[PDB]
Amino acid sequence: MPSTLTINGKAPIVAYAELIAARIVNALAPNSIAIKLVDDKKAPAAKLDDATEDVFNKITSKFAAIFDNGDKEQVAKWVNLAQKELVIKNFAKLSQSLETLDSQLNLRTFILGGLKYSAADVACWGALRSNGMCGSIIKNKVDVNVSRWYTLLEMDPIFGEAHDFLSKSLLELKKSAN
Amino acid sequence: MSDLVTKFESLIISKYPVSFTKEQSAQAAQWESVLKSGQIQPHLDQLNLVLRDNTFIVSTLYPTSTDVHVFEVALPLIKDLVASSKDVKSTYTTYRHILRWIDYMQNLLEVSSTDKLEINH
């Protein structure tokens, strides 16, 4: 039987990274994780079974067959940034942080440099999706590389349709009542 | 029609599908006629602009054949000019987008010791 990832739709920062990790595992190893939605402002942004702290790590470590490439130590570096730095709605702070990424991506297609993405790419793209301040900074590309990178992953339905799944899900939550 | 077209189709992705917008069709158009004339080199600067915003030549999730045809003619011409560079570290900064594209595809198509390009980081 699966885990239950429960994510919250009224949350100020919506846990898109976690939704996207869950969808990857499901894509390769079907029924590994059940996704559950809950519209309610007194509720954590994400919950894996019981754990509320460190949920992304938990998913990522658990299914280590799917999450293997990239030097562990280094995936930690960029998961950190993502979680504690690319969420903040403060243009002065963001810009500095986006620059770090934009330099990292100079001679690269993916963050840690491989031929395919890693957990780092997930943590970051998710963070930037939740923080809607970043929408305008792209869309109109203050940091060229970051805009090129983000645009790529957007084309992958596991990433770029992550939003609809949520919209649809919350629609169904209102039906199942009401 | 050549060696690298083979090893691309040895790979899951040729494969498919696309695809193709009115935009994207006309894009891979001008990049094939560029090759027909023989005038790759004097369009490096365009290629670099294209590659600045788009990860692959025709704005696709994975490389298309165009991304290989062009790469075949591009790879030598780039690495030649990295030799003849005086600053290079200009060249690098001047052509960093063609450079990350190369670096991707030369590993995707398993080019030999050879052949392959330095790539510093």
Q: Which domains does chain B have, with CATH numbers?
A: 1-121 (1.20.1050.10)
Contact residues on chain B for A149, CB-CB shorter than 8 A: 55
Q: Which helix (H) or strand (E) holds A48?
A: strand A46-48
Q: Give the Cα-Cα-Cα angle A95, A98, A104 (nearest 5 degrees).
A: 145
H or E segment to which residue B107 belongs? helix B96-108
What is the rounded distance in angstroms from the CA atom of residue B40 to the CA atom of residue A9? 51
User: Looking at CA atoms only, how far is residue A150 from chain B in angstroms?
Assistant: 10
Q: Per CATH, which fold does A65-155 belong to? A: Glutathione S-transferase Yfyf (Class Pi); Chain A, domain 2 (1.20.1050)
Q: Where are the domains of chain A?
A: 1-64+156-178, 65-155
Chain B: residue whose CA lies nearest to A112 = B121
Could you tell me where the DSSP H helices lie in A131-176?
A: 134-137, 144-155, 157-160, 162-175
**Which of B52, B100, B107 minimises the CB distance to A107?**
B100
- Chain A positions in Cβ-Cβ contact with residue B104 (cut-off 8 Å): 109, 115
Chain B residues close to A151, C-beta within 8 Å:
53-55
For residue A26, the Cα-to-chain-centroid distance in whole angstroms is 15
Resolution (A): 3.0
Q: Which amino acid is at B81?
A: L
Q: Distance between CA atoms of B56 and B18, rounded to whole angstroms?
A: 14
- Reported as half-sphere exposure (CB side, CA atoms, 13 A), residue B75 has a value of 21
The CATH code for residues A1-64+156-178 is 3.40.30.70
Q: How was this structure determined?
A: X-ray
DSSP single-letter state for residue B79: H
